[PDB]
Structures are given as structure tokens and as C-alpha cells.
Design a protein around this ligand. Structure first.
Ligand SMILES: [Cl-]
Ligand SMILES: [Mg+2]
Ligand SMILES: [Mg+2]
Lengths: 472, 464
């Protein structure tokens, strides 16, 4: 309803917990223009969003300073309640949304109006919460909208630019029709409605994949400068000239496909679903650790910084190694010969699906295979939360009603399902293995990605502590 | 309120100007899947009405003729046509099932009635619609996705093994089609899709050239001249074709931009031009079903032939040809949204006003189809009269919303000849086609309207 108001206690509430990250604890969130499996654009925009929270609250802190702005500190009385911090954080992310997520502006404008806040207030009075928030959010957008991500589309061109357009000149050595180098990434052919549950798009249209925002590997990281300094071993397990090792890596993917259970299917979908598994695991960790509003903003910043910097490094190596995905390797080893694996929707495991008709449980991501973006990112986020919160406790239970699976709706899971992760360690280990259940990654890739991501959580923790303490 | 006895379900319900219709899962510019599914829908109308006609027989079914008293009013014919297309929707357009179920319920018809009593309108309609789907869902279009595979098939999947000789990144043969790189939200107004994702084009349903046509058996028998204007080894002719496209781009007016969008909007220009012709000729319900079948048959068979030649000639689109001729050099053309004509847009940053279609250039699908449809309506209705006016309020353009057109605009086509001539030239304004391609496509499509008229008359007369 146009006049409906949102109940929220500005004085004692927590806008991150009570407004932004609220959910019923079951199923998947509503869909919008950001596809849940598109981790690169998701991680980039979410970092702008969640950093604006921290920068908006920093002047209300006794010592903290912002990442992208330095706003003169407020008297302590302005933090006696959470009202100013709540207002400032909301306006800061509103500025980021207006700059980087214009699709969300109408819903956010309506939510702000329902909270009693003027959605057209562009004041930048630095003694007011709205002015601090607007200033902090604008500073994040001003520093990042023109970064290497090309989020506005103007990089290296003057006409007809499109947001997130690749300006780096990446070209695969394989086409979707011909596997010239079986060690190298090959674009998949996918229906235009390309999400796990179909999703938005055009009926009867097919496309060939393009490397998703390869320029991500070039954007300025938050805690370091050059992602090449984080060395990653070569993916020797996928050298097609070592036919025995290549075939073993393929057979492990097919065996994972053949062994799929309801729980593995749901976990495959869960860990690829960025607005749920990635965004809301810090919420679960925060709920288990009794953090105040400042602690939530700090935890989310440390997690987002870890995701941001680890994914840049993962994307750098994705392009440098440019590694083949499982579906191409399955076809390379077996051609049209039948294999034992998932037969497709409603089919369960079958003994004789032709290898060139096999597909992973989830639609394969549109970028090279090595390393795993999700696994690197979650390992970084798990380490960041570990370091900030002081322990490994996560205690996240999420419910999946019968038939709520997106790949096989109405059939998977066969009955109501509750998944629980007591620790980040359980969480990140499930993420890595679920990438193999999804058919998106080889076992060794997921294992190496787990080890590769952890270090970025430590860098993120140091970075956020430096800003909490005032950056002197 | 719809009147079953004297009303017309095609006129009063299905095809009920200004602006563009609401968007759904079928993108308006995607002509191949649109024409295929629409032919099943509109053929089911005719087959449902044939037993209620004194002599007509169905295309995909033969239902024993009804007593004339059951055609005294339009009630049975209206009921039968609605259930017939409902059967096609359930088989070939499942996305539309909820809206149609609701529309039938609002009319007082049970959307769960699967009766096939051939003495009742619901039974005749259900039977006529199911026969169309049974005959066509497994044709060469691969609409269900099972062609030449047993696992993980996807509707409309290309089974033909077509691949371009160019990749989206490298133009090796400038005479041949090169797929474009496009944002995933790929429609003129953006459209549904995923933020921040780009794709390389795939030839849209190349198998369309292989599906069994309605009025002939082999599309190769319809000769189409070679696109000599696009032989890159003849640099002068190639550059002339390119420069004509750039000059059309530089000369774009509000009217040309809106007409470019209009003729690429299949649910409007293609679907509703027979409505305008039917309205201008005061046809009864039978005449509407017959006209739409002649038009749909002409579109179906002409587009099959166009798709056959699109694959055989596999010709380059203007954006690739502009890049071949000029590389990065500046040209005079449209500068992009909000910029108008500019003197120095780098050629490798130029784009047509509308997103280029995802199939080879020669011949033009829209132009061939409209020329076939225009001829079909001409032959059936006996004259060239169309008398269609469509309004575009200020700012209603999809490519440049709020700016184009600068003021309220009315487009009028008195005749099919004016309509098809505007369609051909608008493909050049759109940047999608070369001038000679549009001209040749107009000449190529006309013949399929004559074939369609003969085919429908044979069925109207009883197919003896
Ligand atoms: Cl071919
Ligand atoms: Mg608190
Ligand atoms: Mg009538």
C-alpha cells in the first residue's frame, strides 16, 4: 500500500539487522535484476553498499574514520541512541543505490518514505544524520563508479558504452562450437533465460557465454594493489596432455553428478545464491555474537572487504589461467559415449546419458574454471568473520520447504529440509564441495580455492581495525 | 462485455491505437519463434470454425460438419475458437496459460473442460487445437527441445550444427555474419534479464529453415539473388552499402526512429496489421479467421524460406561491415542515446538505432514477412486498403524514452503498399539491414502471399 509504514525503532533498532538483512529463514529471497549466481557484479556493488554503512557510522564512533570519506567526528551525545546512525546508514546506502543499483531505487524510495524519511533529501549538512549519510554514500560512489569495473560503461570509448562492458579485450581460444584447447575455457551455449529457475529473459533465444566482467581482476583492491602478488599454483590437474589426470578430474565430476542427493542439490543451489549464502552468513554470525549496531557495520565491512579483495584476485587468476570448465572436459574425454551421472530434471541418476548431453546440476558459470570464485570468496569471508568475531561460531540454520529447489521445483527437496552450519569451517567446506555437486568445478580446483581465499580475510581484518582505530 | 452471439472473439478479445503492448517472455523483435507459435494459434482458430462453415475443412483436422442452425449466431464458433487456441497455448505457450485460464473463466467458460464431444463447441475446439499441436509440436522447429538428443534438451535448441565463420571478437570474413556482443537485457527498452552480463549472439532458431512449410515442401525452390552488394572483395560496392547505412543513421528523424521501433515490434506491426485490414473491410467472424490464417500462412512460409536463405547466404550485418570499412576512423552517424547526429563517432563504436537481430542479414526477416503478409491480405480482401493509424505520444519511444518523439506523433498507412515500403526502409533506419537487402526482401516475400491465398481458399472450399 502506498501509505503503508514500516515499523522500526530508530532509537534502539539496528537497520542492518532489522531492515536490510531481514528474512523469514526459509527459501530463497525474491528475484530482481541481479542474478543470484552472478558473483562478480554482486560482490562489487555490495561492497559499495556495505562500505557506505561503515563510512556513515564512522563519525558517530569515538575513533573510527571512513574508508572513502573523512567526516568530522560528532559529539558522543549524538550516539546516545541509534537514531542518527540508523538514519545516516540508510541515506548512505541510498546514495550508493542511486549511483550503482538504479533498478532498486523505486523500492528503496518507497521503503524510506514508509520509515518516515524524506527520499528526496539531498542535504549534506555534516551535523545531521541525513547529511552525513548522503556525504558518505556519495563519497563511496564517487571513488568507485569510475574504477576498473566499468560499471557506468564509459571506459576506453566515447559512444554507445554499456555498463560493465568488457574493455580488456579478453578472447577465449575456444568457441562454443569448437574445443580447440581442451585445457582452456570454452563458452557454453545457454538459453537466454539462464538462471537455475529459468529467470527473466526472452523465450526461445540462446546465447554464447562471455567472460563475466573480466575487468574485475583489474579494479583497485581495498587492502593491496596487485593481485598477481598472491601466487596460485597452476591447474596441472586439467592439463589435457596428462590424459590420466584430466580423465580422473572428469570422472570425479561425473561421480559427484551420479551421487546427487536432495541435500547436495539444495546445497549446490544454496552456495551459488549470493543474496542468501554470501550476504546473509555474516548476518547469522552477527546474530550468534551479540553485536551492537557498530559491530554489525564493522563485521559486514570486514566480510565484504574480504569478498571484494579475494574475488579480484580470483578473477585475476581466472583470466591468467583461463581454464576449461567441466562440461567441456566431460565431452573431451568421452565424446558421445554414455556415462553414469545425473540424467537431467526428473531423471535422477542414469547409467547411459551421452557425455555430450551431460550438464552440471546448475547452469555453469560464464567464466573460466580456476580458481572457484565462490569458494575463494567464502573462504576469505569465513576468515574475516573468524578474525573479527574471535571464534569460528556461525550457528546458521536455513529451511528449504519441500519442492522449493529451483532446478527441480516441486520434486527437490522431497520433504522439508533444514540445513545447519555450526561453524564457518563447516560452511566453507560445504561451499567448496557444493561447487563439484553443481558440476561447475573440479575437486582439486575447489580444494585449492579454499586454501587460496583464507589469506584475504586476514588482510580485511587488519584493514577494518585500522579504520576503526582512526587510521593514524 | 463480450457478446457470444453477435461478437467476434478475434476482434473483441484476442487482438484488442497508441503505444506498445505490454511485454512478456516473447521479445517483440524475435520474429522466428513468434511467427511459428502464432501460426499454430491462428490456424487453430480456422480449424475450430471449419465444421461450422458450409464447406470449409480444417488444415490439421477433419471434424464432421455441424448443422447450419449451430452457426445462426457466433456463439459456438466463438467458443470453439477460444478452446482451440487454449489448447495451442497449453502446448506451445505455457507462459500464457494463467492469463488465458483467467480470461476464459471471466467469459463463463470452464478452463478445465477437456471434453472432445464433436457435437459441442468446446469439444470441437479442444479437438481442433490438439490436432494443430500434435502435428506441429514435433516438427523441425524443436519447440520442445528433444530433437536429436535424449537428455537435457532445451526448447528451440539449435540442432543443425550451424556456426558462424566469424566470432564476436574477430571478423575473419567481412562478407559473412558475425554475432554481436550484447547486454543480457537485450531488448530495445532493456527488457528482462540479468544485470551486468553480456552474451554473444547465436543464430536464432536456424532450424526454422528446415521445418515443414504449409504450402510447399522445399524452400530452396524459391530463388533469391546473391547479395553481391556485400561481397567484401568488391570494395566499392561493399563501402557503398555501408555508407548508405551510415547516412540513414546520420539522417534519423523522430518519425524514422519510431517507425524503426514500430516495424520491429511483432505483436504490433505484424500481429495487428491484419486486424486493421479486417476492420477496414467489415468482415464477419469467418472472414476474420480466414484473413488471419492467410496472413499467418504467408508469414510462416515466407519466413521459412527467408531463414533457409539467411543460413545459406550467412551474410554480414551492418555493424560488422561498418567496422571493416572504417575500423576506428570517425564517421558521421547517430552518436547514441541523447546525442543525435555527430560528426566523429568512431566506426567501431557505432551501433544501429535498434539492437541488431541475432541472425544473418540476408534476406530481411521482417521485410520478407510483411511483403508476404501484405500480398496475402491483398489477394484475400481484393484491394490494397489498410487504413491503420497508430499514435506515439511524446517520449513514448523505447530506445530514447522521454526524448523521442519530441512531440505527439501519428503514423498512418492507407495501403499495404505504403506499410511494406515503410517496413523495408525502417530496417535501414534501424541499422539492422542494408538498403539493397531490404529492397530484394520486399520483392522476395510477395510470392508467398499468393501461395497462402490459394492454400486457404482450397480449405475454405473443402479441399476436393
Ligand atoms: Cl550451416
Ligand atoms: Mg544496537
Ligand atoms: Mg460477425
Amino acid at each position: 500500500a502506498p501509505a503503508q509504514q514500516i515499523p522500526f525503532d530508530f532509537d534502539n533498532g539496528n537497520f542492518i539487522r532489522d531492515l536490510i538483512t531481514t528474512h523469514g529463514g526459509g527459501g530463497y529471497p525474491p528475484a530482481d535484476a541481479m542474478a543470484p549466481g552472478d558473483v562478480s557484479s554482486y560482490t562489487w556493488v555490495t561492497h559499495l553498499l556495505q562500505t557506505s554503512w561503515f563510512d556513515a557510522l564512522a563519525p558517530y564512533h569515538p575513533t573510527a574514520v571512513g574508508v572513502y570519506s573523512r567526516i568530522p567526528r560528532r559529539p558522543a551525545e549524538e550516539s546516545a541512541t541509534n537514531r542518527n546512525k540508523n538514519i545516516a546508514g540508510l541515506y548512505a546506502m541510498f546514495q550508493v543505490v542511486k549511483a550503482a543499483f538504479t533498478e532498486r531505487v523505486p523500492v528503496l524510495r518507497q521503503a524510506l518514505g514508509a520509515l518516515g524519511l524524506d527520499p528526496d533529501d539531498e542535504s549534506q549538512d555534516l551535523s545531521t544524520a541525513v547529511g552525513i549519510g548522503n556525504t558518505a554514500g556519495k563519497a563511496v560512489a564517487a571513488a568507485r563508479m569510475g574504477d576498473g569495473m566499468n560499471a557506468l560503461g564509459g571506459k576506453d570509448r566515447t559512444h554507445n558504452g554499456q555498463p560493465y562492458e568488457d574493455y580488456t579485450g579478453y578472447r577465449p581460444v575456444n568457441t562454443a562450437d569448437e574445443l580447440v584447447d581442451p585445457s582452456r575455457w570454452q563458452p557454453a551455449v545457454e538459453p537466454h533465460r539462464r538462471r537455475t529457475d529459468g529467470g527473466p529473459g526472452d523465450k526461445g533465444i540462446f546465447t554464447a557465454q562471455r567472460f563475466a566482467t573480466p575487468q574485475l581482476g583489474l579494479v583497485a583492491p581495498q587492502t593491496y594493489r596487485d593481485p598477481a602478488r598472491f601466487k596460485l599454483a597452476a591447474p596441472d590437474h586439467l592439463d589435457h596432455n596428462d590424459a590420466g589426470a584430466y580423465r580422473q578430474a572428469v570422472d570425479e565430476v561425473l561421480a559427484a553428478s551420479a551421487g546427487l542427493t536432495d541435500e547436495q542439490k539444495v546445497k549446490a543451489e544454496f552456495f551459488e545464491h549470493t543474496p542468501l549464502s554470501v550476504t546473509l552468513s555474516p548476518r547469522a554470525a552477527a546474530m550468534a555474537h551479540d553485536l551492537d549496531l557498530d559491530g554489525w557495520a564493522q563485521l559486514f565491512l570486514v566480510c565484504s572487504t574480504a569478498r571484494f579483495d579475494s574475488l579480484i584476485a580470483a578473477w585475476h587468476h581466472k583470466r591468467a589461467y583461463d581454464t576449461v570448465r567441466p562440461f567441456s572436459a566431460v565431452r573431451h574425454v568421452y565424446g558421445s559415449k554414455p556415462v553414469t551421472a545425473w540424467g537431467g530434471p526428473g531423471k535422477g541418476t542414469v547409467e547411459s546419458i551421452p557425455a555430450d548431453e551431460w550438464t552440471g546440476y546448475l547452469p555453469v558459470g560464464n567464466h573460466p574454471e580456476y580458481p572457484s570464485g565462490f569458494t575463494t570468496l567464502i573462504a576469505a569471508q569465513a576468515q574475516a568473520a573468524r578474525s573479527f568475531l574471535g571464534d569460528d561460531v556461525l550457528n546458521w540454520t536455513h529451511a528449504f520447504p519441500a519442492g522449493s529447489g529451483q532446478r527441480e521445483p516441486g520434486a527437490v527437496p522431497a520433504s522439508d529440509l533444514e540445513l545447519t552450519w555450526a561453524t564457518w569451517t563447516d560452511f566453507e567446506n560445504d561451499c567448496a564441495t557444493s561447487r563439484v555437486w553443481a558440476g561447475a568445478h573440479f575437486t582439486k580446483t575447489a580444494e585449492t580455492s579454499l586454501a587460496f581465499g583464507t589469506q584475504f580475510g586476514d588482510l580485511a581484518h587488519t584493514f577494518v581495525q585500522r579504520h576503526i582505530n582512526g587510521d593514524v
